[PDB]
Amino acid sequence: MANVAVEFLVENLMQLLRDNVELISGVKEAAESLLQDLNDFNAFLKQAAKCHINENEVLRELVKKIRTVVNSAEDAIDKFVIEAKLHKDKGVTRVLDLPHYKRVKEVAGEIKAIRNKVREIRQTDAIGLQALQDDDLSARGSEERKPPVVEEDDVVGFDEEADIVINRLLGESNHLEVVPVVGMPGLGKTTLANKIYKHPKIGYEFFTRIWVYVSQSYRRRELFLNIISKFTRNTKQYHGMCEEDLADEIQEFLGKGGKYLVVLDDVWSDEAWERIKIAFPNNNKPNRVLLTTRDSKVAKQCNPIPHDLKFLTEDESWILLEKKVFHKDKCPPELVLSGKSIAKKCKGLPLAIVVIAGALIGKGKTPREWKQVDDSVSEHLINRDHPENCNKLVQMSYDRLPYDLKACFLYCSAFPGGFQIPAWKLIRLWIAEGFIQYKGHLSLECKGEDNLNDLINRNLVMVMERTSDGQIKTCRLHDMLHEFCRQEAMKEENLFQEIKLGSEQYFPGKRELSTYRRLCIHSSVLDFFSTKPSAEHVRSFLSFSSKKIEMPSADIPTIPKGFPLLRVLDVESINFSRFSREFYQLYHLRYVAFSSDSIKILPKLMGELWNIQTIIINTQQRTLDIQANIWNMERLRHLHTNSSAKLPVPVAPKNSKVTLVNQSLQTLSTIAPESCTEEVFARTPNLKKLGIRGKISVLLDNKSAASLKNVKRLEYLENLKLINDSSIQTSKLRLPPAYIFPTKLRKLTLLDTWLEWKDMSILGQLEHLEVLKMKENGFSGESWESTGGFCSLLVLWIERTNLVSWKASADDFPRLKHLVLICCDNLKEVPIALADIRSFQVMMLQNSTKTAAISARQIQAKKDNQTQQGTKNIAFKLSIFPPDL
Amino acid sequence: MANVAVEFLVENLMQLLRDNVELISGVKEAAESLLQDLNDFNAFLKQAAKCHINENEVLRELVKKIRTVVNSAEDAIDKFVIEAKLHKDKGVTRVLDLPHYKRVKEVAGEIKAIRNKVREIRQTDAIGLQALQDDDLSARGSEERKPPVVEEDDVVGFDEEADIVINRLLGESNHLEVVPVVGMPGLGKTTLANKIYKHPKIGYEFFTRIWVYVSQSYRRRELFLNIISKFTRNTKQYHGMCEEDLADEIQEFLGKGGKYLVVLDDVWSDEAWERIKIAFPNNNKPNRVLLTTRDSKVAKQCNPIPHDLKFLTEDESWILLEKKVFHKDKCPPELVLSGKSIAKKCKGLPLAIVVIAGALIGKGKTPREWKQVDDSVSEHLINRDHPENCNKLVQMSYDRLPYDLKACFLYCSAFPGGFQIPAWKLIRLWIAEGFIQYKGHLSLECKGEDNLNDLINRNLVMVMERTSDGQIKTCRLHDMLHEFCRQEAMKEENLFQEIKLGSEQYFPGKRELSTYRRLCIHSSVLDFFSTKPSAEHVRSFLSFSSKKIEMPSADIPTIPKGFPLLRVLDVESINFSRFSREFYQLYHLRYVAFSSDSIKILPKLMGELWNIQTIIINTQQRTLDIQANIWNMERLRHLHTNSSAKLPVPVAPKNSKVTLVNQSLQTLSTIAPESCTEEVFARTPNLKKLGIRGKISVLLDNKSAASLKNVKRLEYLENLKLINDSSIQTSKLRLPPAYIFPTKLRKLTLLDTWLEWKDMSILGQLEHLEVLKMKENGFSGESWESTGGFCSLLVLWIERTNLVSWKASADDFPRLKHLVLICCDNLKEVPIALADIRSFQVMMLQNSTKTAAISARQIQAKKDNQTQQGTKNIAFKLSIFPPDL
Ligand SMILES: O=P(O)(O)O[C@H]1[C@@H](OP(=O)(O)O)[C@@H](OP(=O)(O)O)[C@@H](OP(=O)(O)O)[C@@H](OP(=O)(O)O)[C@@H]1OP(=O)(O)O
Ligand SMILES: O=P(O)(O)O[C@H]1[C@H](OP(=O)(O)O)[C@@H](OP(=O)(O)O)[C@H](OP(=O)(O)O)[C@@H](OP(=O)(O)O)[C@H]1OP(=O)(O)O
Ligand SMILES: Nc1ncnc2c1ncn2[C@@H]1O[C@H](COP(=O)(O)OP(=O)(O)O)[C@@H](O)[C@H]1O
Ligand SMILES: Nc1ncnc2c1ncn2[C@@H]1O[C@H](COP(=O)(O)OP(=O)(O)O)[C@@H](O)[C@H]1O
């Protein structure tokens, strides 16, 4: 929507005028006039939106040439901004310094020319309401959208096929065979496969099972690294092995553990199946593999008897539609007829129902809306096998979307098809692109998360992993939806443009690149940067590669000089040996994510990019030294980093009354313990997530417990993470008193701390803490006896600890929901009192002692009895990773 | 509720531990113990609340005494705090301050005794905790509540009485007669009176209408001065004029203006009517007085033909109850029988029905709850004449009320009965007393506002005036509810005790004053403070008087010495000429409201009190030079004042990296323009309401300090006020560009600005500004021609302007809903284009040109036709000051 670009330009111009006046002093008057006209045309575009746009070419023409003028104004303003900053760099004290000054205010003359063009547009419709405001539709208020709790986990109508396949399993013991699952894309084949892969009988028959995604454009070596990594604790030895040596290692590991079932999803081509099949040992075991392929030919090649997947019936279609739209409630009688008719028209494709239900929940719950959508679906689905019909359905659903969500939904497809998108990354990117403008009181991150939840609720985005606390971790768009979004954003809206090197595709030259606004490179990027490309009007650069691609020492200056107006730079997959001097002139940089392996310092000149919001640094070094003054940066909002980051000691200016209190800051992933001083925590009043990585002894030492004492000050802190790197238990550590931990702390994670289980009482004294995760021997001891306190704890996660005896009563954990017990090889028993917790929903046991498994089974039986006794107790599910335990 | 005391103690203790260790260094261990045992006691009390403590005697005792130890622990800890700060004052640099350290350690011995007493009882609490937890009830989550917009304004089945009354008037012209209104309390007589006082026929016949409240304890001169205040601005002169001569002036003012109606509200005794009737001239005109009384004898004396109020009929009862319970929505069929039975059981007393509706709202909307309510009401309403039936009904409603809200109703009674409680003051009290605890993310004030709105929704608190934008401005408790709340809070929970004295009675002695927690004095207070009283366990002192009482120069230091452990000091109605030293030693002070007339300098030592939230100062001086380092009082949240305060110039400490950035702050009501400086705004990042008073020119002048520019920094500001005191128009003032104003600004007010009507475009450019109030010639000029911009503006308020020609199109004010044209004696007419605005509902035209009023009637007729034309247009209301128009 043009509204988005207009609003972002307005906001950026206002910010420029307020904060830095000198930069805009030369042009400030033209800037202000442009800003007024921008507000006016934002209102104009809103009105034009009120009227049907896709049903009128004249309307689109009207809004057109506002977008072009806006882009020209944007580019002129940015070029002047950078030029004036270079003038400041020149530091020319001369009152009249014509060189570059004539031409810079002549860029201001480009700004004035575009200002005049904006004025001419204003003239064309001085009112802007001459004929358009006369018409307005969809006038209504906006209501609340609610959180996306897990629902309809039951798969409608796929149990019969699942049973058929699970019967197809173990047909001929002592042999390896592949079970083909065939169906048109979007028929739910991967849903059936996932259901089977988690079925209890499947888990019990095969001790080992693996899920592998074989994209249309997979790479074999990554795939084998992925498969092996599950079985091995370390992949270092195999990182230097060849594809075939890797296959042999996989065969060995996989034959170690008896039988096995491997699921290969979306095997596009026969050649891929042939290339991969070698790693599976036909070891004369009753082994199996389940493949999901959209093509009948490859399915026949794999096995002459493919399992043809069935369309859902009309009754099943209606059931799924109602389930999706009304969740746990029931469809009002007046809407039942329309819903059933729609489901009938769907033809039974689960994806079609899942999308139409999204459209319905988007629109509303009145019979008129349902009649309208029924008419639309009748019109658009006359044919059956044409793949464009689902595209038309997606068009229907996407039309109703709010424009702010339309921008985000489009931007989602920038990621390579089949990529698992880190939700936090996606949200920080949205914020960096300005798609989410401050609307109300919610913090930006919270608003973005809400956006993502609405997207998922509509079903326009699929969820892959949920963090322990249940929120979203990684999501991906469906293949057809990904294609739709790619085509839409690339053609209709020109949001971004992809450069995929096919067997024949050759790099577009400078002239085509001049038109692009955002680049995404997901194929060989080193070849692209050997071209020494150039583009002034590319603002964003995205590269979501699979491998990590070193940057040649000669091509490093290609990114800055190639694009000097960059805003979003997502180059995590690209190792940089160092940073050229032209990185310190990308002044329009908001988001900057990259990787490295030899970077030990962030040079102070990085402190000049005054605009940046996010910073991500994935460096292998153990110690990273941030010399760049994060405090000077006025808008820093995130500082993720793996290494231990040593923040610069704050230094209040001797003659300035500026308080360097960054009020926007919201994260500091792994600051070093040595920089948890009082000042650092003074400067981040609104800090919402903190983590430390280093020698936790300095902090937790009482003789030096002033540091976690300092952490007592971040009133808003909600996520604390303590990570110990020192491998020597040079002394014992004691947790300071419970009152020292900020009162809202909801999530704590401990790793290699070696604390006494007698300190669990302190964490019991915390009242809001809701997810506790201790890994790599966070707490040391053989006997632990729960003393209550965890009033609001929801997920308990113990991993790799030498605990032996655990004693607790039902009242120790009133609100426990998820219990994760990994690699506790030395715990004799699990207290049965836990069987008496109502919140206790799902239990997981992994690499644990046999007595623990026995006690867990007693707990399962006990909770089954409790539910059978009529008590409204939520369903219980137990999952021991090794079935034999 | 005990949980409230325990929670407040816990929070205060935790804060003391975190901030100041030296104060607690002596008894840190006992402090932390107390903290733990208090948390456990709070959990125990919650659990006991889950069960019905009243049902079991053992429970009543078990809950009992946990509170006493908590009260005992508070007294000892507070006394230690003050004694230790006194030690700091001594500054005894000796390593062992054996003299008087053994005194503060005597207090510490009290502390340690208390800690041991808590550990005891905690043991006694340990036993039986399981027996308590075995039982629970009302297991449910908490749902959202919604804002209380005006609803059910119409009065059920009362138009018969209204028309009968309006008929009674005009019986005998050229004569003065008073019409009695009789009925039991809460029967709605005031409702009927207000209905009549607003009826269009009444507003047309009598030009001069006056509404007067005559409490049980009125004071004649007070109301006479108020009546005079209606006709002329000031009352200070007549403050030097006798009551009978006041009455003469009232009679003259009233007789000059044609006919007159006056409503005397809630007349109790005959003598009061006799005394007050004097002011009304029987000048041989058709004038009437409408008195409402609960006694038949006074009514009969005033007239042998009293108007008995009628009970509501069963159908009327049910319609009223349904309207209250279900608001606009109709009753669900399954609850109709229960609702009708309940209404029938109320015997037609509107107050009983109203409280029952509140109770039903509190319970929910399930048939079981309605059956339970029906049973209960049948139980408690066997009798009719006994007034205690309504007390039982309010008790029934109260029991279902959350304890946070419960803490109110009872604290609401503290305000003197019949007093109009300023909502903002009430909320800041709430906060200061600690009744409102951080639960979530809403700013404290917002949580208070929602509490108050919920109280109104349950109908327990009746509202009196709303601000222009509609948010509540002034509420009070109904008489029956007030007596119920006062008795309850004084007896059951001992929240506070009133000291008001009867004839032949004496002020309670020091022994009695030793068992008080809060003092409310609403009668002679100078007499009380001439007793030289003394109490150590009084934390709050409230004095909501009528007249401003001075404090004798010899009797000043009674309060600081009478009570040294004060928190709330609400002495707004007591004029202090100076402050004693013993006042500065008060350290437990949160709230401090007081008046004055000669106080020009806020003392420096006043800045030592670390714990203050609010500050109110009604100094008559024009300037109030503040020298208290507000920057150092870390909990400061308001600095209300009326004169032009001058905040101290901030200075970041030379040798401390601690930034003096207050982030709780919310308002700096009336600072001086000289103190609208950069730093003063850097130090208050979260400021949410600013006002200025002084020579607005120095702001609008850029040479002194770009101060209205500096206002740009307060990203959260939402209420601005520019008050100009300079009466000399030295030069014209020009508003800065619209981008300077904070983006969220939602309310602006300009008095004496004398800005040129051309600038109104700048205020048009603002996008959220919702209420513009220009009073006493805000803008100077004679021709105003709207150019648009006020997209979101909702209320327009013009007072005392020389505007002659106003030109506008319907597109300039799309969202307008309220228009106020006060004292526009030079304006000719208002653009009829406003008649086309759908949102336009209410417009008030006071003391303006008759041509403007004719245009107003044209607008009214046009909107009448518009609504008649089938458009879903909201009802329109026209208010015109003089009847002839
Ligand atoms: O600390 P944990 O409870 O073990 O959770 C971590 C943490 O994420 P959260 O604290 O937000 O939950 C890490 O956060 P970052 O390091 O990315 O800031 C994240 O990443 P790492 O793997 O690099 O530690 C990691 O991911 P994973 O689950 O893959 O181990 C995992 O996140 P979740 O708990 O959200 O899944
Ligand atoms: O209700 P108040 O607390 O008395 O304040 C509001 C207004 O501010 P807001 O409109 O933002 O609420 C002014 O602010 P303050 O003076 O209270 O700081 C106030 O000014 P004055 O009291 O000096 O007149 C004015 O007073 P008034 O009610 O007499 O108009 C009154 O106006 P509203 O209640 O209509 O908002
Ligand atoms: N049996 C089913 N019940 C409900 N939804 C289903 C079912 N089968 C498929 N779907 C939905 O159909 C859509 C397409 O399936 P998906 O799992 O995304 O990929 P695939 O088509 O490869 O199976 C998704 O929204 C999926 O949840
Ligand atoms: N139809 C009605 N007639 C009278 N009061 C009504 C009616 N409907 C609701 N009420 C409410 O019942 C109460 C009537 O008594 P009230 O006016 O409070 O007492 P009093 O007349 O003694 O001041 C008010 O709260 C009023 O708003």
Numbering used by the authors:
A (entry chain A), B (entry chain E): 1 to 885
According to the publication:
Unlike most NLRs, the plant NLR required for cell death 2 (NRC2) belongs to a small NLR group characterized by constitutively high expression without self-activation. In this study, we discovered that SlNRC2 forms dimers and tetramers and higher-order oligomers at elevated concentrations. Using cryo-electron microscopy (cryo-EM), we performed structural analyses and found that SlNRC2 adopts an inactive conformation in both the dimeric and oligomeric states. Structural comparison shows that SlNRC2 dimerization and oligomerization act to stabilize the inactive conformation.
